[PDB]
Design a protein around this ligand. Structure first.
Ligand SMILES: O=C(O)COc1c(C(=O)O)sc(-c2cccc(NC3CCN(S(=O)(=O)Cc4ccccc4)CC3)c2)c1Br
Length: 288
């Protein structure tokens, strides 16, 4: 048994999952988020209590208002960087794609549905048919090139076009459609099969900008996705990681990563199961 599997069992048999989560909540460093609280930025925030820190927020270069609810999560020991953002609002979809272009982002990971429990969690920021989606405020257009519908997720091939310079770029849109809000995936196998499909696409490689991970608020399910992938990269280096400390370090870049104790427990399960690294996952996932 590994040092992660022994801690997992002790946390399970002793029922210490919620106190561990409360420890992470209390040990979380608070940082200034003044730009997010400006009066001009009220219509750019989906939730009042979810704001990006000033020191790590992503800036929209050369725009009149450079604010977007997006945080750059840097893990130097892992050579990995993610942009965790909220589900775009109808008026910030143009800022979302300007950010994707400026940061040279290759992949967009979506872990939420457009509609969840009688509420819209994210605007339809990519086209569903062959019609062009225009974003004139930032001068961008998005076309749906191809889509691959699996059982519990869909991969869209999107063409992001700079309508001013004519330059186009292909974007891989991974849409996890069966991850409930404030909940966990069906199994560690279905999540790891999705995470490794993102890895196998080369869109997390250093030849690209940071991938954009987003759900509804960009801290709950997005934090669970980011913590597992970061830990799986750190353990490949040969480090005996402390999952609690890796999460608290990530929480210095964006507040409230991982929202429920069950999401934290699932992170331990996915890290333990993913540590053994796959074809088994694809079959257990039942994506076909
Ligand atoms: O993806 C999911 O699973 C769920 O996604 C979701 C939502 C959805 O999908 O509908 S809503 C939502 C939400 C909206 C407002 C406030 C809070 N909760 C607050 C609680 C307090 N925290 S915090 O980070 O603990 C505040 C803090 C900052 C720094 C230091 C200490 C505390 C912010 C979020 C959560 C989250 Br999350």
């Amino acid at each position: 048994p590994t040092t992660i599997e022994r801690e997992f069992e002790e946390l399970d048999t002793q029922r210490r999952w919620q106190p561990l989560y409360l420890e992470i909540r209390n040990e979380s460093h608070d940082y200034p988020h003044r730009v997010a609280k400006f009066p001009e930025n009220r219509n750019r925030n989906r939730y009042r209590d979810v704001s990006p820190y000033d020191h790590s927020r992503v800036k929209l270069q050369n725009a009149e208002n450079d604010y977007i609810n997006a945080s750059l999560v840097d893990i130097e020991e892992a050579q990995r960087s993610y942009i965790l953002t909220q589900g775009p609002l109808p008026n910030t979809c143009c800022h979302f794609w300007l950010m994707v272009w400026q940061q040279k982002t290759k992949a967009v990971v979506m872990l939420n549905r457009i509609v969840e429990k009688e509420s819209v969690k994210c605007a339809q920021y990519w086209p569903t048919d062959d019609q062009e989606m225009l974003f004139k405020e930032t001068g961008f257009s998005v076309k749906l090139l191809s889509e691959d519908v699996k059982s519990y997720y869909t991969v869209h091939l999107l063409q992001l076009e700079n309508i001013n310079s004519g330059e186009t770029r292909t974007i891989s849109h991974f849409h996890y459609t069966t991850w409930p809000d404030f909940g966990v995936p069906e199994s560690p196998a279905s999540f790891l099969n999705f995470l490794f499909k993102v890895r196998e696409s080369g869109s997390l490689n250093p030849d690209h900008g940071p991938a954009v991970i987003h759900c509804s608020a960009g801290i709950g399910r997005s934090g669970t996705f980011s913590l597992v992938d970061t830990c799986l990269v750190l353990m490949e280096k040969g480090d005996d990681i402390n999952i609690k400390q890796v999460l608290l370090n990530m929480r210095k870049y964006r507040m409230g990563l991982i929202q429920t104790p069950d999401q934290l427990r699932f992170s331990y399960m996915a890290i333990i199961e993913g540590a053994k690294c796959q074809k088994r996952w694809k079959e257990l996932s039942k994506e076909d």
